[PDB]
Coordinates of all heavy atoms in Angstrom, one line a residue:
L273 N -40.9 0.2 -15.7 CA -41.4 1.5 -16.1 C -40.7 2.0 -17.4 O -41.3 2.7 -18.2 CB -41.1 2.5 -14.9 CG -41.4 3.9 -15.1 CD1 -42.9 4.2 -15.4 CD2 -40.9 4.8 -13.9
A274 N -39.4 1.7 -17.5 CA -38.7 2.1 -18.7 C -39.1 1.3 -20.0 O -39.0 1.8 -21.1 CB -37.2 1.9 -18.5
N275 N -39.4 0.0 -19.8 CA -39.8 -0.9 -20.9 C -41.2 -0.6 -21.5 O -41.4 -0.8 -22.6 CB -39.9 -2.4 -20.3 CG -38.6 -3.1 -20.2 OD1 -37.5 -2.7 -20.6 ND2 -38.7 -4.3 -19.5
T276 N -42.1 0.0 -20.6 CA -43.5 0.2 -21.1 C -43.8 1.7 -21.1 O -44.7 2.0 -22.0 CB -44.4 -0.5 -20.1 OG1 -44.3 0.1 -18.8 CG2 -44.1 -2.0 -20.0
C277 N -43.3 2.5 -20.3 CA -43.6 3.9 -20.2 C -45.0 4.2 -19.6 O -45.7 5.1 -20.0 CB -43.4 4.7 -21.5 SG -41.7 4.7 -22.1
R278 N -45.5 3.3 -18.8 CA -46.8 3.3 -18.2 C -46.8 2.7 -16.8 O -45.8 2.0 -16.5 CB -47.8 2.6 -19.0
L279 N -44.2 5.4 -12.0 CA -43.4 6.0 -11.0 C -43.6 5.2 -9.6 O -44.5 5.5 -8.9 CB -43.8 7.5 -10.8
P280 N -42.7 4.3 -9.3 CA -42.8 3.5 -8.1 C -42.4 4.3 -6.8 O -41.6 5.2 -6.8 CB -41.9 2.3 -8.3 CG -40.9 2.8 -9.3 CD -41.5 3.8 -10.1
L281 N -42.9 3.8 -5.6 CA -42.6 4.4 -4.3 C -41.4 3.7 -3.7 O -41.5 2.6 -3.2 CB -43.8 4.3 -3.4
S282 N -40.2 4.4 -3.7 CA -38.9 4.0 -3.2 C -38.1 5.3 -2.8 O -38.2 6.3 -3.4 CB -38.2 3.1 -4.2 OG -38.9 2.0 -4.5
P283 N -37.3 5.2 -1.7 CA -36.5 6.4 -1.3 C -35.3 6.8 -2.1 O -34.9 8.0 -2.1 CB -36.1 6.0 0.2 CG -36.0 4.6 0.2 CD -37.0 4.0 -0.8
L284 N -34.8 5.9 -2.9 CA -33.6 6.2 -3.8 C -33.9 6.5 -5.2 O -33.2 7.3 -5.9 CB -32.6 5.0 -3.7 CG -31.9 4.8 -2.3 CD1 -31.1 3.5 -2.3 CD2 -31.1 6.0 -1.8
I285 N -34.9 5.9 -5.8 CA -35.3 5.9 -7.2 C -35.8 7.3 -7.7 O -36.3 7.3 -8.9 CB -36.3 4.8 -7.6
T286 N -35.6 8.4 -7.0 CA -36.1 9.7 -7.5 C -35.3 10.3 -8.7 O -35.9 10.8 -9.6 CB -36.2 10.7 -6.3 OG1 -37.1 10.3 -5.3 CG2 -36.5 12.1 -6.8
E287 N -33.9 10.2 -8.6 CA -33.1 10.7 -9.8 C -33.3 9.7 -11.0 O -33.5 10.2 -12.1 CB -31.6 10.8 -9.3 CG -30.7 11.0 -10.5 CD -29.3 11.5 -10.1 OE1 -29.2 12.8 -9.9 OE2 -28.4 10.7 -9.9
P288 N -33.2 8.4 -10.9 CA -33.4 7.5 -12.0 C -34.8 7.7 -12.6 O -34.9 7.4 -13.7 CB -33.3 6.1 -11.3 CG -32.4 6.4 -10.1 CD -32.9 7.7 -9.6
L289 N -35.7 8.1 -11.8 CA -37.1 8.3 -12.2 C -37.2 9.4 -13.2 O -38.0 9.4 -14.1 CB -38.0 8.5 -11.0 CG -39.2 7.6 -10.9 CD1 -38.7 6.1 -10.7 CD2 -40.1 8.0 -9.8
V290 N -36.4 10.5 -13.0 CA -36.6 11.6 -14.0 C -35.9 11.3 -15.3 O -36.3 11.7 -16.3 CB -36.1 13.0 -13.4 CG1 -34.6 12.9 -13.0 CG2 -36.4 14.1 -14.3
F291 N -34.8 10.5 -15.2 CA -34.1 10.0 -16.4 C -35.1 9.2 -17.2 O -35.4 9.5 -18.4 CB -32.9 9.2 -16.1 CG -32.1 8.8 -17.3 CD1 -31.3 9.7 -18.0 CD2 -32.3 7.5 -17.8 CE1 -30.7 9.3 -19.1 CE2 -31.6 7.1 -19.0 CZ -30.8 8.0 -19.6
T292 N -35.8 8.2 -16.6 CA -36.8 7.4 -17.2 C -38.0 8.3 -17.9 O -38.4 8.0 -19.0 CB -37.4 6.4 -16.3 OG1 -36.3 5.7 -15.6 CG2 -38.3 5.4 -17.0
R293 N -38.4 9.4 -17.2 CA -39.4 10.3 -17.7 C -38.9 11.0 -18.9 O -39.6 11.0 -20.0 CB -39.7 11.4 -16.6 CG -40.7 11.0 -15.5 CD -41.3 12.2 -14.8 NE -40.5 12.6 -13.6 CZ -40.7 12.3 -12.4 NH1 -41.7 11.5 -12.1 NH2 -40.0 12.7 -11.4
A294 N -37.7 11.6 -18.9 CA -37.1 12.2 -20.1 C -37.0 11.3 -21.2 O -37.3 11.7 -22.4 CB -35.8 12.8 -19.7
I295 N -36.6 10.0 -21.0 CA -36.4 9.0 -22.0 C -37.8 8.6 -22.6 O -37.9 8.6 -23.9 CB -35.7 7.8 -21.5 CG1 -34.2 8.1 -21.3 CG2 -35.8 6.6 -22.5 CD1 -33.4 8.7 -22.6
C296 N -38.8 8.4 -21.8 CA -40.1 8.0 -22.3 C -40.8 9.2 -23.1 O -41.4 8.9 -24.1 CB -41.0 7.5 -21.2 SG -40.6 5.8 -20.7
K297 N -40.8 10.4 -22.5 CA -41.5 11.5 -23.1 C -40.7 12.3 -24.1 O -41.3 13.2 -24.9 CB -42.0 12.5 -22.0 CG -43.2 12.0 -21.2 CD -44.4 11.9 -22.1 CE -45.7 11.5 -21.3 NZ -46.9 12.0 -21.9
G298 N -39.4 12.1 -24.2 CA -38.6 12.8 -25.2 C -38.2 14.2 -24.8 O -37.9 15.1 -25.6
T299 N -38.2 14.5 -23.4 CA -37.8 15.8 -22.9 C -36.3 15.8 -22.7 O -35.6 14.8 -22.8 CB -38.6 16.1 -21.6 OG1 -38.1 15.3 -20.5 CG2 -40.1 16.0 -21.8
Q300 N -35.7 17.1 -22.6 CA -34.3 17.3 -22.4 C -33.8 17.2 -21.0 O -34.6 17.5 -20.1 CB -33.9 18.6 -23.2 CG -34.3 18.7 -24.6 CD -33.7 17.6 -25.5 OE1 -32.5 17.4 -25.6 NE2 -34.6 16.8 -26.2
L301 N -32.5 16.9 -20.9 CA -31.7 16.8 -19.7 C -30.4 17.5 -20.1 O -29.8 17.1 -21.1 CB -31.4 15.4 -19.3 CG -32.6 14.6 -18.8 CD1 -32.2 13.1 -18.7 CD2 -33.1 15.0 -17.5
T302 N -30.0 18.5 -19.4 CA -28.8 19.3 -19.7 C -27.5 18.6 -19.2 O -27.5 17.8 -18.4 CB -28.9 20.7 -19.0 OG1 -28.9 20.5 -17.6 CG2 -30.1 21.5 -19.5
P303 N -26.3 19.1 -19.7 CA -25.1 18.6 -19.2 C -24.9 18.9 -17.7 O -24.3 18.1 -17.0 CB -24.0 19.3 -20.0 CG -24.7 19.8 -21.3 CD -26.1 20.1 -20.8
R304 N -25.5 20.0 -17.2 CA -25.5 20.4 -15.8 C -26.2 19.2 -15.0 O -25.6 18.8 -14.0 CB -26.3 21.7 -15.5 CG -26.2 22.3 -14.1 CD -27.5 22.9 -13.5 NE -28.7 22.1 -13.8 CZ -29.1 21.1 -13.2 NH1 -28.4 20.6 -12.2 NH2 -30.2 20.4 -13.6
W305 N -27.3 18.7 -15.5 CA -28.0 17.5 -14.9 C -27.0 16.3 -14.8 O -26.9 15.7 -13.7 CB -29.3 17.2 -15.7 CG -30.1 16.1 -15.1 CD1 -31.1 16.3 -14.2 CD2 -30.0 14.7 -15.2 NE1 -31.6 15.1 -13.8 CE2 -30.9 14.1 -14.4 CE3 -29.1 13.8 -15.9 CZ2 -31.1 12.7 -14.2 CZ3 -29.2 12.5 -15.8 CH2 -30.2 11.9 -14.9
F306 N -26.3 16.0 -15.9 CA -25.4 14.9 -15.8 C -24.3 15.1 -14.9 O -24.0 14.2 -14.1 CB -24.8 14.5 -17.2 CG -25.9 14.0 -18.1 CD1 -26.5 14.8 -19.0 CD2 -26.3 12.7 -18.0 CE1 -27.6 14.3 -19.8 CE2 -27.3 12.2 -18.8 CZ -27.9 13.0 -19.7
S307 N -23.7 16.3 -14.8 CA -22.6 16.6 -13.9 C -23.0 16.5 -12.4 O -22.1 16.2 -11.6 CB -22.0 18.0 -14.2 OG -23.0 18.9 -13.8
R308 N -24.2 16.7 -12.1 CA -24.7 16.6 -10.7 C -25.4 15.3 -10.4 O -25.7 15.0 -9.2 CB -25.7 17.8 -10.4 CG -24.9 19.0 -9.8 CD -24.6 20.0 -10.9 NE -24.1 21.3 -10.3 CZ -24.9 22.3 -9.9 NH1 -26.2 22.2 -10.0 NH2 -24.4 23.4 -9.4
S309 N -25.6 14.4 -11.4 CA -26.2 13.1 -11.2 C -25.2 12.1 -10.5 O -24.0 12.5 -10.3 CB -26.8 12.6 -12.5 OG -25.8 12.1 -13.4
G310 N -25.7 10.9 -10.2 CA -24.8 9.9 -9.7 C -24.0 9.3 -10.9 O -23.1 8.4 -10.6
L311 N -24.3 9.7 -12.1 CA -23.6 9.3 -13.4 C -24.0 7.8 -13.8 O -24.1 7.6 -15.0 CB -22.1 9.4 -13.3 CG -21.4 10.8 -13.0 CD1 -20.0 10.7 -12.6 CD2 -21.6 11.8 -14.1
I312 N -24.3 7.0 -12.8 CA -24.6 5.5 -13.0 C -26.1 5.2 -13.0 O -26.7 5.5 -12.0 CB -23.8 4.6 -12.1 CG1 -22.3 5.0 -12.1 CG2 -24.0 3.1 -12.3 CD1 -21.6 5.0 -13.5
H313 N -26.6 4.6 -14.0 CA -28.0 4.1 -14.0 C -28.1 2.9 -13.1 O -27.2 2.1 -13.0 CB -28.4 3.8 -15.4 CG -29.8 3.5 -15.7 ND1 -30.4 2.3 -15.4 CD2 -30.8 4.3 -16.3 CE1 -31.6 2.3 -15.8 NE2 -31.9 3.5 -16.3
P314 N -29.3 2.8 -12.3 CA -29.4 1.6 -11.4 C -29.3 0.3 -12.1 O -29.0 -0.7 -11.4 CB -30.8 1.8 -10.9 CG -31.1 3.2 -11.0 CD -30.4 3.7 -12.2
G315 N -29.4 0.2 -13.4 CA -29.3 -1.1 -14.2 C -28.0 -1.3 -14.8 O -27.8 -2.3 -15.6

Side-chain angles (χ1 to χ4, degrees), residues 273-277 280 282-284 286-315:
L273 175 59
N275 280 350
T276 66
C277 298
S282 298
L284 295 174
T286 299
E287 168 161 277
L289 234 63
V290 63
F291 184 78
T292 311
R293 281 199 267 265
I295 289 302
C296 283
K297 286 292 183 154
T299 72
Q300 305 299 304
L301 295 169
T302 63
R304 190 216 40 82
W305 187 90
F306 292 97
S307 67
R308 268 100 170 270
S309 75
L311 306 163
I312 309 308
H313 188 278

